[model samples]
Target: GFKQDIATLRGDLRTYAQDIFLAFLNKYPDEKRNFKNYVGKSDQELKSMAKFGDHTEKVFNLMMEVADRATDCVPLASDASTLVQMKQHSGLTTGNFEKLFVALVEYMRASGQSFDSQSWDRFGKNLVSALSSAGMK
Candidate 1:
């Protein structure tokens, strides 16, 4: 398990998640309507939303699972279950998945940390595959 390696980046995970959420909202304004409950909220409120809102926690845990067991396919099932639930409820798509993945990578890069890119790529592909298997279009 690369748990230790991933733990090293824990400090930046919230920032990474926030940036991703904000970028996601900016890029897909219509998507913002999905979380109308947060409408008219302050930056701190939005930041709070980004920190502990909706699928963020689940996504974070799945990311840790991927980071911890990069070479193992075992985690994919668990991750897929979460992905499936998100897809079913939130209309999550391949594009959203890619955005989140890119966000994570951007965060990692910005943090000036070294990680196994190849493994991360493989994990990402597996996630997409899992999404497909979960009946995503």
Candidate 2:
């Protein structure tokens, strides 16, 4: 199970992060350059950034966790259309949430911090809560 967790996460995290990122970019054109600048940093720069004295990465990571939880905040509906319509009604912000999730995960990875159980639990619970609220139950 441990090996499986690690194996599955290898590409999943990167792809998930990219997907989240793309979703955000699709929604907010203005943030494109800044977002790119953040994601495009070299791994070394990312590590140094993550390791800086203020524990900035730690704070950033927690915010990401909140965003990760926020991503799941959709009201339940029958289909994608229902959800889409509901998005209009609810003014829910899935796109931004997705971008945050991806960016944070990437930050953690770039910092050489191992992604494992803790991250997964945080993301999963938040996602389910978001979805459940949207009538996705």
Candidate 3:
């Protein structure tokens, strides 16, 4: 997979972090509801929020790991309980979780990280499986 190097993809994550999340919010606006503090807030406003910034980084990091590494794709075992609670509270359906990966893959594609549909498909599958294991819908 080095032909479509994850190194490049990781670089894109560091550079276009905000854009990826924004794309997700635009594509799956309903999923934005789960981010209670961000609800009803404009994109620029949300960008300025301290909480939003941290959340975006963590979300992307985990998603990166979700793609690059599977060992902790369900999130760390230490935080598994809290993760489950949060995932359940968000009513995180597998479809919505898959959408997040889809959004990320699109960002990577645009950045020329990789155009292969298979990578995105695999990532989406991993995310949904992780979501299911986390005890969400």
Q: How close is candidate 2 to the true structure, as a TM-score?
A: 0.30
- TM-score, each model? 0.64, 0.30, 0.70
Query: Residue 31 of candidate 1: its Cα lDDT?
Result: 60
Off by over 4 Å in 1: 1-4, 11-16, 23-31, 38-45, 49-55, 69-75, 86-90
Which has the better TM-score: candidate 2, or candidate 3?
Answer: 3
Residues 6-111, candidate 1: write the lDDT tens digits: 6755656666556656655665566666668656765467876543454665556557766565456335556566666763455667666656565555554555
Backbone clash numbers for all candidates listed: 0, 8, 0
Per-residue lDDT of candidate 2, residues 1-137 (tens digit): 22344344443554433444444344456544543554555434543542332333333343343333343332223333343345332544455445555554454455453555445445644554554455443
Whole-model Cα lDDT per candidate? 0.60, 0.43, 0.64
Q: Per-residue lDDT for 27 in model 2? A: 49
Report how far off residue 60 is in candidate 3 (Å): 1.6
- Which stretches of model 2 miss by more than 4 angstroms? 1-29, 32-92, 117-137
Error of 2 at 7 (Å): 25
lDDT tens digits, residue span 28-76, model 3: 8888777777788887898888877777777767655545544422344
Task: Please list all clashing residue pairs in model 2, or write none if there are none.
Answer: 72-130, 73-130, 74-134, 75-134, 75-135, 76-134, 76-135, 76-136
Backbone clashes (count) for model 2: 8
